[PDB]
Scaffold this active site. Structure first.
Site, short mmCIF file in Angstrom:
data_model
loop_
_atom_site.label_atom_id
_atom_site.label_comp_id
_atom_site.label_asym_id
_atom_site.label_seq_id
_atom_site.Cartn_x
_atom_site.Cartn_y
_atom_site.Cartn_z
N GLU A 80 14.86 9.42 1.95
CA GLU A 80 13.67 8.71 2.39
C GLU A 80 14.05 7.28 2.84
O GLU A 80 14.91 6.65 2.23
CB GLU A 80 12.66 8.72 1.24
CG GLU A 80 11.40 7.96 1.46
CD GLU A 80 10.48 8.04 0.26
OE1 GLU A 80 10.60 8.98 -0.57
OE2 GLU A 80 9.63 7.14 0.11
N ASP A 82 11.83 3.82 3.84
CA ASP A 82 10.46 3.33 3.66
C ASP A 82 10.19 1.91 4.14
O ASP A 82 10.96 0.99 3.82
CB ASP A 82 10.09 3.24 2.17
CG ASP A 82 10.11 4.54 1.46
OD1 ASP A 82 9.59 5.54 2.01
OD2 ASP A 82 10.61 4.64 0.31
N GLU A 84 6.80 -0.37 3.28
CA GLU A 84 5.53 -0.45 2.57
C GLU A 84 5.00 -1.88 2.70
O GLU A 84 5.67 -2.82 2.27
CB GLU A 84 5.71 -0.08 1.10
CG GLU A 84 6.06 1.38 0.89
CD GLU A 84 6.43 1.71 -0.57
OE1 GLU A 84 7.59 1.43 -0.96
OE2 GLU A 84 5.56 2.23 -1.31
N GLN A 97 7.89 -4.44 1.94
CA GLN A 97 8.88 -3.86 1.06
C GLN A 97 9.59 -2.72 1.77
O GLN A 97 8.93 -1.83 2.35
CB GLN A 97 8.22 -3.35 -0.22
CG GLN A 97 9.21 -2.75 -1.22
CD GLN A 97 8.56 -2.31 -2.53
OE1 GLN A 97 8.34 -3.12 -3.41
NE2 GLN A 97 8.27 -1.02 -2.65
N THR A 98 10.91 -2.74 1.75
CA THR A 98 11.72 -1.60 2.19
C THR A 98 12.45 -0.94 1.04
O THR A 98 12.65 -1.53 -0.04
CB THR A 98 12.71 -1.99 3.29
OG1 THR A 98 13.52 -3.10 2.86
CG2 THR A 98 11.96 -2.49 4.56
N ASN A 99 12.87 0.29 1.28
CA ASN A 99 13.51 1.13 0.28
C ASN A 99 14.24 2.27 0.97
O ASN A 99 13.91 2.65 2.11
CB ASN A 99 12.48 1.66 -0.73
CG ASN A 99 13.09 1.93 -2.12
OD1 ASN A 99 14.30 1.77 -2.33
ND2 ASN A 99 12.26 2.37 -3.05
N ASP A 107 15.26 3.12 -5.89
CA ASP A 107 15.49 1.85 -6.59
C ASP A 107 16.35 0.88 -5.82
O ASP A 107 17.14 0.12 -6.41
CB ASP A 107 16.07 2.09 -7.98
CG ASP A 107 15.24 3.06 -8.77
OD1 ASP A 107 14.11 2.70 -9.11
OD2 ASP A 107 15.62 4.21 -9.04
N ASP A 173 -2.38 -0.94 -9.38
CA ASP A 173 -1.45 -1.11 -10.50
C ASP A 173 -0.24 -1.98 -10.22
O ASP A 173 0.32 -2.52 -11.16
CB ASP A 173 -0.99 0.27 -11.00
CG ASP A 173 -0.88 1.34 -9.93
OD1 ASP A 173 -1.83 1.50 -9.14
OD2 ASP A 173 0.17 2.02 -9.88
N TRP A 174 0.17 -2.14 -8.95
CA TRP A 174 1.42 -2.85 -8.66
C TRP A 174 1.54 -3.63 -7.33
O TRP A 174 2.43 -4.45 -7.23
CB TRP A 174 2.60 -1.87 -8.75
CG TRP A 174 2.60 -0.79 -7.69
CD1 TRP A 174 2.06 0.45 -7.80
CD2 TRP A 174 3.18 -0.86 -6.38
NE1 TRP A 174 2.27 1.16 -6.64
CE2 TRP A 174 2.95 0.38 -5.75
CE3 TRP A 174 3.89 -1.84 -5.68
CZ2 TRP A 174 3.39 0.67 -4.45
CZ3 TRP A 174 4.33 -1.56 -4.39
CH2 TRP A 174 4.09 -0.31 -3.79
N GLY A 178 2.19 -8.13 -8.55
CA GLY A 178 2.64 -7.24 -9.61
C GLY A 178 1.55 -6.41 -10.24
O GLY A 178 1.76 -5.77 -11.27
N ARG A 253 19.23 -6.02 -13.04
CA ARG A 253 19.06 -4.55 -12.96
C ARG A 253 20.34 -3.87 -12.48
O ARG A 253 20.61 -2.72 -12.84
CB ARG A 253 17.91 -4.17 -12.00
CG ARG A 253 16.70 -3.47 -12.65
CD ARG A 253 15.80 -2.65 -11.67
NE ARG A 253 16.08 -2.87 -10.25
CZ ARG A 253 15.47 -2.24 -9.24
NH1 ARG A 253 14.50 -1.35 -9.45
NH2 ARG A 253 15.80 -2.54 -7.98
#
Ligand SMILES: *[C@@H]1O[C@H](CO)[C@@H](O[C@@H]2O[C@H](CO)[C@@H](O[C@@H]3O[C@H](CO)[C@@H](O)[C@H](O)[C@@H]3O)[C@H](O)[C@H]2NC(C)=O)[C@H](O)[C@H]1NC(C)=O
EC number: 2.4.1.207
Length: 267
Positions: A80, A82, A84, A97-99, A107, A173-174, A178, A253
């Site tokens: 995927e 993304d 967003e 936001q990319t992913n 992640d 929720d996010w 946040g 992380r």
């Protein structure tokens, strides 16, 4: 990128009455209310190509909404790519936001602010996806690069044909601060608008799973193995001034930096 009509390349998949068609389908609006959002997907599946959409985001108060434009494969261990867009209270900035997911694992979030009001005009959002790399572009600016680093043991979207999807949904929720800023449903409908609907890709069925002209397309040529120095300087500017979160430089992380970073200039 050349502008075609929506129905050439795409079909609605949820809440058909929440997609409004203008000028023969050359422009569409997705609406979101407290009962439903909506979404659409490409008729075809593709392995590599150039995918572009002009979008104008939800104006005014868009807190708690997410507008997504993405490619995804369909089996388990999915790939995927993304975009967003996370909305905000009036006069407060959107986040893009990319992913990237490979073999079912994502992640790899990055979040940026934009250098324009994404609600005021249409802008291009694009993915170039070939055997060498994935480039995310906002108009002509590269905001991210994900290189094919299989040689270092890292997975890359390489043999699973993907469809293009887009949708508008609440994510209270996010999405905004946040999850602290909730959607104000008295401000519905939330409307995201689209044009162009450009698909230039290697058509490859979920069944046959390959394209006959592979390795011979314009994105397979040597000019597209990497970004040039000018494009890398644009990217570093995005990295230095517009980036608010980057999984690559997140050492809390990711103690062991993601092997792709140094190649992608995300560091
Ligand atoms: C929606 O609008 C709000 C502002 O109302 C945005 O929240 C702000 O996000 C920025 C960037 O993350 C935060 O600034 C940064 O804070 C860190 C330390 O926490 C600092 O290292 C940076 O240099 C920078 O100052 C800011 O604190 C934050 N403000 C609030 C009130 O939360 C938000 O990003 C907008 N977008 C979305 C989708 O929420």
């Amino acid at each position: 990128p050349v502008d075609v009509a929506f129905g050439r390349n795409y079909v609605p998949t949820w809440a058909f009455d929440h997609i409004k068609y203008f000028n023969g389908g050359n422009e569409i609006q997705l609406h979101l209310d407290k009962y439903t959002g909506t979404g659409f997907q490409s008729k075809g599946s593709y392995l590599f190509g150039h995918f572009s959409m002009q979008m104008k985001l939800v104006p005014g108060d868009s807190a708690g909404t997410v507008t997504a434009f993405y490619l995804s494969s369909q089996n388990s261990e999915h790939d995927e790519i993304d975009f967003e867009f996370l909305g905000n209270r009036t006069g407060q900035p959107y986040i893009l936001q990319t992913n990237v997911f490979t073999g079912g694992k994502g992640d790899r979030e990055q979040r940026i602010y934009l250098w324009f009001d994404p609600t005021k005009e249409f802008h291009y959002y694009s993915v170039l996806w070939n055997m060498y790399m994935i480039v995310f572009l906002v108009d002509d600016v590269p905001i991210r690069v994900f290189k094919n680093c299989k040689d270092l043991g890292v997975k890359f979207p390489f043999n699973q044909p993907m469809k293009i999807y887009s949708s508008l949904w609440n994510a209270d929720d996010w999405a905004t601060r946040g999850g602290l800023e909730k959607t104000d449903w008295s401000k519905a409908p939330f409307i995201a608008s689209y044009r162009s609907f450009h698909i230039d890709g290697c058509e490859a069925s979920v069944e046959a799973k390959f394209c006959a002209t592979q390795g011979a397309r314009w994105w397979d040529q040597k000019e597209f193995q990497d970004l040039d120095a000018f494009q890398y300087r644009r990217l570093s500017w995005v990295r230095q001034k517009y980036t608010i979160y980057n999984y690559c430089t997140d050492r809390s992380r990711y103690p062991s930096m993601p092997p792709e970073c140094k190649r992608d200039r995300d560091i």
